[PDB]
Amino acid sequence: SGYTPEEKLRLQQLRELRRRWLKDQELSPREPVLPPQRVSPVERFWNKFLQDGALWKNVIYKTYRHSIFAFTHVLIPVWIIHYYLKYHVTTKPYTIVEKKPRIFPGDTILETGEVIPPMKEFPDQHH
Amino acid sequence: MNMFSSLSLVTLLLLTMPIMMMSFNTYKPSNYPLYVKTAISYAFITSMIPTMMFIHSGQELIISNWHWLTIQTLKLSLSFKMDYFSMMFIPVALFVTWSIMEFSMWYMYSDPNINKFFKYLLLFLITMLILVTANNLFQLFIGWEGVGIMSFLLIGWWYGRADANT
Amino acid sequence: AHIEPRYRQFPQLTRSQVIQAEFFSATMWFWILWRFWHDSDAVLGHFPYPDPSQWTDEELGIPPDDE
Amino acid sequence: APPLTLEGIKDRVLYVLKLYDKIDPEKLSVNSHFMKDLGLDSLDQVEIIMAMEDEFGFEIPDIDAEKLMCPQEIVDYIADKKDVYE
Amino acid sequence: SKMELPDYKQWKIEGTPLETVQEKLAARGLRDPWGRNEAWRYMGGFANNVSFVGALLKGFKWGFAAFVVAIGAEYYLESQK
Amino acid sequence: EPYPDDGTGYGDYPKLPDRSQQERDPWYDWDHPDLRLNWGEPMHWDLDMYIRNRVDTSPTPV
Amino acid sequence: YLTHQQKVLRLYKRALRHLESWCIHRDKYRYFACLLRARFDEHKNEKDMVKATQLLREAEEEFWHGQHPQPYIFPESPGGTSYERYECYKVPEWCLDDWHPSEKAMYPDYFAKREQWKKLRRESWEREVKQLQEETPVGGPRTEALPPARKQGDLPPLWWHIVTRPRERPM
Amino acid sequence: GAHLARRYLGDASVEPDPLRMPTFPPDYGFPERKEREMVATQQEMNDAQLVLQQRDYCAHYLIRFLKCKRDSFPNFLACKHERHDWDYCEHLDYVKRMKEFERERRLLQRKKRREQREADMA
Amino acid sequence: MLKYIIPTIMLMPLTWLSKNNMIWVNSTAHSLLISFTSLLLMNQFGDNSLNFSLLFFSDSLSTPLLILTMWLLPLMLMASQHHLSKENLTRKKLFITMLISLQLFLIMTFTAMELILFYILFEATLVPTLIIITRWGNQTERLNAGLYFLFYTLAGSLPLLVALIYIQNTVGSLNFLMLQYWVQPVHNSWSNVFMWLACMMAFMVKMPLYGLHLWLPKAHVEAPIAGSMVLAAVLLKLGGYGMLRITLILNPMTDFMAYPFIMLSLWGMIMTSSICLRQTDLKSLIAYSSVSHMALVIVAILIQTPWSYMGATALMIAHGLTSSMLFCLANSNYERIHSRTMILARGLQTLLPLMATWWLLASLTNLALPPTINLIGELFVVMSTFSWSNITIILMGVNMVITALYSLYMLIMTQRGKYTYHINNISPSFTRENALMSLHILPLLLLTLNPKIILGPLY
Amino acid sequence: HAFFKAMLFMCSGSIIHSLNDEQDIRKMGGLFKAMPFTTTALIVGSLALTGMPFLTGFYSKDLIIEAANTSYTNAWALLMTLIATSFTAIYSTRIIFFALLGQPRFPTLVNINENNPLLINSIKRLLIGSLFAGYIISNNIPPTTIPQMTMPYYLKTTALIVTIL
Amino acid sequence: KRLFIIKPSGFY
Ligand SMILES: CCCCCCCCCCCCCCCCCC(=O)OC[C@H](COP(=O)(O)OCCN)OC(=O)CCCCCCCCCCCCCCCCC
Ligand SMILES: CCCCCCCCCCCCCCCCCC(=O)OC[C@H](COP(=O)(O)OCCN)OC(=O)CCCCCCCCCCCCCCCCC
Ligand SMILES: C[C@H](CCC(=O)O)[C@H]1CC[C@H]2[C@@H]3[C@H](O)C[C@@H]4C[C@H](O)CC[C@]4(C)[C@H]3C[C@H](O)[C@]12C
Ligand SMILES: *C(=O)CCCCCCCCCCCCC
DSSP states (O other): OOOOHHHHHHHHHHHHHHHHHHHTTBOOTTOSOOOOOOOOHHHHHHHHHHHTOOSSHHHHHHHHHHHHHHIIIIIHHHHHHHHHIIIIITTSTTSEEEOOOOOOTTOBOTTTOOBOOOOOOOOOOOO | OHHHHHHHHHHHHHHHHHHHHTTTSSOOSTTHHHHHHHHHHHHHHHHHHHHHHHHHHOOOEEEEEEEEEEETTEEEEEEEEESHHHHHHHHHHHHHHHHHHHHHHHHTTTOTTHHHHHHHHHHHHHHHHHHHHBOSHHHHHHHHHHHHHHHHHHHTOSTTOHHHHO | OOSOOEESSOOOOOHHHHHHHHHHHHHHHHHHHHHHHHHGGGTSOSSOOOOGGGSOTTTTTOOOSOO | OOOOOHHHHHHHHHHHHTTOTTSOGGGOOTTOOTTTTSOOOHHHHHHHHHHHHHHHTSOOOHHHHTTOOSHHHHHHHHHHHTTOOO | OOOOOOOGGGOOOTTSHHHHHHHHHHTTTOOOTTHHHHGGGGSGGGSOOOOHHHHHTTTHHHHHHHHHHHHHHHHHHHHHO | OBOOOSSSSOTTOBOOOOOOGGGSOTTSOOSBTTTTBOTTSOOOTTHHHHSTTSOOOOOOOO | OOOHHHHHHHHHHHHHHHHHHHHOSHHHHHHHHHHHHHHHHHTSSOOOHHHHHHHHHHHHHHHHHHOOSSOOOOTTSTTSTTTTTTGGGOOOGGGGGGSOHHHHTTOHHHHHHHHHHHHHHHHHHHHHHHHHHHHSOSSOOSSSOOOOOOSSSOOOSSOHHHHTOOOSSOO | OHHHHHHHSSOGGGSOOTTTOOOSOTTTTOSSOOOOOOOSOHHHHHHHTOOGGGOSTTHHHHHHHHHHHHHHTTOTTOOHHHHHHHHHHHHHHHHHHHHHHHHHHHHHHHHHHHHHHHHHTO | OHHHHHHHHHHHHHHHHSOGGGHHHHHHHHHHHHHHHGGGGGOOOSSSOEEOSSSBEEOTTHHHHHHHHHHHHHHHHHHHTTTTTTSOHHHHHHHHHHHHHHHHHHHHHHHBSBHHHHHHHHHHTHHHHHHHHHHHOOSTHHHHHHHHHHHHHHHHHHHHHHHHHHHHHHHSOOBHHHHHHHOOOOOOOHHHHHHHHHHHHHHHHHTTOTTSOTHHHHHHHHSOHHHHHHIIIIIHHHHHHHHHHHGGGSTTTHHHHTHHHHHHHHHHHHHHHHHHHTOOBHHHHHHHHHHHHHHHHHHHHHHTOHHHHHHHHHHHHHHHHHHHHHHHHHHHHHHHHOOOBTTTSOOHHHHOHHHHHHHHHHHHHHTTOTTSHHHHHHHHHHHHHHHHOTTHHHHHHHHHHHHHHHHHHHHHHHHSSOOOTTOOOOOOOOHHHHHHHHHHHHHHHHGGGSGGGGSOTTO | OHHHHHHHHHHHHHHHHHTTSOOOGGGOOOOTTTSHHHHHHHHHHHHHHTTOTTSTTHHHHHHHHHHHHTSSOOHHHHHHHHHHHHHHHHHHHHHHHHHTSSSOOSOSEEOOOOOOHHHHHHHHHHHHHHHHHHHHHHTTSOOOSOOOOOOOHHHHSHHHHHHHO | OOBOOOOOOOOO
């Protein structure tokens, strides 16, 4: 067994072409040639700001990013949701229904000032 | 009540925002897995506040905020059940999803469609939260089938592999 | 890379991964020991289990046979 | 999964063969026919291919494996499957 | 780029369980010609590995040391009360 | 070999071995690698049932 | 068709691989791999080809009885966990012809190189077809083997889809 | 445990039927038996919103525990003594159910012992 | 209805008097404007239908069908203009004319007050449909498909004509409002059995009913793409609309006359759904899918409950958009590879990414993913059929499993796996193709927000 | 279950990635020291799954077994459950023994690296959950039943004994 | 070494 002389010669010829093809898949240094790039003045600040390095100004940027997230994705959504619930949902009947609070002996009702009586004396078990 | 109900809903709305932003409105590719992972971690935090309130006093409520459809004597309304099971499971699911997404940022780093992968993971989570908070069986069925189809799409992620499609 | 691959040899390790791994294995065993010191009942037993055969017939209300 | 190179493949292929007791490391070159030069039989060649599969972590089908009769042919076969061109 | 391979002559079956296999093959008049290709798995950082119990007790010395200090601290706080 | 000339309508279509495409050599250079078919060869009557996503007939160890 | 020798060597490789799946531990596998080789060496010289066939059939029956029900499979081999995992990323080169001109302008060097390859393919085609016509018997080809290029400046007939096939890790 | 072997692999006539016990009158052999005291009123358990299966003869300890848990928030390691009183009250309630089973079994034995003795007369 | 009839008629001179190179732009733009005005039909009242005149009216049943009909015309012009690009100008204009005339007959069909006016327009739709199939279909089989289409329809509709005239002689009117007040119960006699069959078989053939459906896989498969869109989206719904109307005058006989047709439908939907699993022609698979879905509409109409009537109305609308989308998706592959065989072109997700998203969305609506209106309609029918007989949930359940299987089998076979090596002409999706798909799916998913407008008069 | 089961998959993903997509445990081995952090998480995860006292899995699995043992229940179902609990220890040992212990059985080019911060921090958070989450959730939820705490010694330690066996 | 990625046209 083993390649016949014909098989070896064809494999060698194909191997040369294949490696030339693979070599031609490499990008040149300038590629990709991107078209005119727009930048924002907000990035201008941060690019110069952080090239310094340090771990005290790599924290301001992190704090800035998280604050912009908290504002756009927590505070504004909760404002919209709170406005929606307070002035549209809860103005209709039975839209938000709370389980009524548990009342325990000795509690005081905030609405009325009523005082709930304590339970009767326990027949103190040994423990 | 006003804080409990506001924060329980924002948890769900917050998770839909990375889906909407993938309408190429604020979209930039490179940061997307980190964006989705950050939304999950915030959703975990907002979900702890209603959970603390339930733990403190056992507060529970039902939100039936949108009337969708009345069929004679069957009124179907988008309604959410913030109770024991949904107050405990939501933070746990979000906490574990938070780790898996951070893990995915490393595991799937060389996948050319990593953004689509994080979109699909997020869509699964949304449908699962719909399932858990559902107050009527129709809304539950939406989440029930939602996770099934997302499961189908994630199992067959490598769609050139015949075994994955099967 | 910061960790270059090796050939037929044990890999290179950062000290960070060894310390962190050691810390969380120690934390596991500290927790187990601390919880067992305080809640050994949760595994062994909360309350003594009575032996029914030792209960007297007077306290279970069993009348004598011939009546 | 770091990338392979032609020299790296050849180095590891020859490295495995120098750990095979039936081969003399001082008479082994890339063009040493396993049967005609090194004087091995076809059962030895099957074991050699199996080692290469273990070395590089992938299978060589029996129809292709049987034709790999020298170290250089093993290198070329691995290089072709891994798209190695340098 | 070139990775440099460890010298191949360092791979020997002596001292490893591959030597036991060789010895009990020589009883039957057989020899194992690939033993040196496996030797690396039994040498260097791979030579010594824990048992199953050793694995489960990872961190137990430091955990137990911290536990003994914790009850002492607990038992000091109680006495100071 | 055609199917038996009952009234079921096979005509002269070849009756080929009832083997799954999963049973074919995966290392051969098929024209349709996923189907493991060559261009021009007769397709099994039930080929769409024997694709690799459906019915498997491979030998089993038990 | 497989010769008798091919059938034996395929069995030997199959038997060893399933043996390795049973043994797992390397030192244990080395031991039993050498016992199995000794069995094959015991009949290496069997001139009677009727008896060598009977030995082969019994060995295959013994293998089927002893095969591991869940043998090890290399990850990318057929049936492996990564088999075909990257086919969804393999895009044929002809798709580049449909790129918009603004997309091609991002890789002026790649596409200039690509035009040379397409020119090479165009100019070789007539000679490749002619070489196959003249080297093929009147009935037609009797095997699937293709010939090499016999001349200088000729390419082996039917090379394009072999040479330009997608990389195994295309993305 | 052992009691299952006796009923299933032995004489089932002198073994209690868990789905039908008690079968003797409560006062058979118990002169002047006291009724069980209930501390928590129906309204208190309704106001506390106890799960119906928790509205047993130990409910008053549970209510005391629930009130402590609410008032000790966020300290979830407090009320550990309140929890134990409820656990111990439930333990004593379980022992009372074990005594009922043992009482039932001994009367079934006594009933049979009378039949055989009252049959050996004939 | 003259505010819709006259503008539709004017599409013809617009088409004929346009510049040669603006026939598609002009007809598409103005047909979309007509579709926009059709939203004025949504002035429906809780009690009374919107009764324009002696000839025409619109209630909550016909209104959604009218809006769908007028929406489909611009989509069909978009779907047709590529494969008619080499047709000579006059024959292009005649093709558009057939589409316009079909729309004219349909919008008058859905608003006709009198059942004999409904009949004439109901048969009238045959003529342009037959011409479209036989003249502009691609294969030899289009001629045979036209004959099956024509004679299956007429075999049923001629007995209907006799029945309707008989009713007018006996009642004195076929005006649908009058029949609501003058309707009398149907006594159980042999003569009334054949009146019932005469009044129903024509509509059953158009659904089609299982057993009487052989015309559909021929006609829907051999027609040009515009022909398939209207055939599946609207023309199948003439049968459902007709049955929903005429059952008014057939009670209580429908109680027992329904049984044979309910069995054909409940078992037929499982049969036709199974057929889809082994179809080799992509267009043929989509056609058999329609038969399975319309079996639910037949069953829903025959059990005559408020829930089944709401479900039937939703399904008819939902199926119309979905089946039309699937035909358009299948056609876009056909225009590239020029074959309808499903296994021919594989792995198209690799070559056409966005088009593979339309395939997924089309498939999900076909298998009735909640909360799509496809699911809402199917669910309401399953609910009502459970009350008709609990055992029906088995047949409904099996069908939903099979439907998921063939819907995703179509998706997996064509979009996934490895692409076919020798098919090298799969050019990128055109803006026209992408707009055509999104004009199906976007309205379909938007209706999920406000489902009541497609739930019919029982809502 | 969500905590330690998710962590186990991530630990296996870490191993799979380090061995170039190898998922067969027969080709692993000798990873106890090569991947110390994945080793720690894998051991914690396995101990949590098998009900090691006071880890996250103990606070549910052990109450479940106690409740089943003391319930009016199908006898065969009870036995199947206990045997399944023992099998849980066996296949948990199977992963640890073949993945981590012994000598390496993977290929010669060693690219083991678990030093990415994304990998460490994601596993680390679930490891903290696999230790304490059961205790924290168990001590904060309101009681909705009457827990059974009185039983013979052998029914109280059944879960632990069969796990040890 | 950066390589070219063959993809279908994304422009349209
Ligand atoms: C009430 C409920 C109704 C619902 C149930 C409806 C059932 C379906 C009815 C189907 C009607 C028949 C089938 C129609 C399909 C088209 C027929 C066809 O294409 O057959 C082809 C056949 C071949 O011959 P040919 O086409 O002429 O050769 C090529 C030259 N052109 O062509 C021929 O050989 C000639 C075909 C002649 C038949 C033409 C159709 C006439 C149908 C009405 C039959 C009239 C019966 C009157 C008899 C009264 C006396 C008994
Ligand atoms: C494949 C071809 C496709 C074309 C299909 C064409 C379908 C045409 C069907 C026409 C049949 C109409 C029925 C004519 C028979 C006379 C009806 C009648 O008057 O009988 C009355 C009686 C009612 O019974 P009952 O409900 O007890 O009375 C009220 C008290 N409760 O009668 C009854 O008991 C009611 C039951 C009548 C229905 C019998 C159902 C038979 C079994 C199901 C067959 C399904 C269809 C088979 C088609 C095969 C065709 C080859
Ligand atoms: C908070 C997080 C920082 C994570 C990190 O640095 O480790 C950063 C990473 C990328 C950010 C997001 C992405 O940049 C996309 C968004 C674009 C807008 O400029 C702000 C909101 C916006 C939605 C982001 C705000 C948020 O702060 C993100 C999520
Ligand atoms: C009396 O009520 C006894 C209830 C059940 C007894 C369980 C004791 C365990 C013995 C079998 C476990 C075997 C697991 C391998």
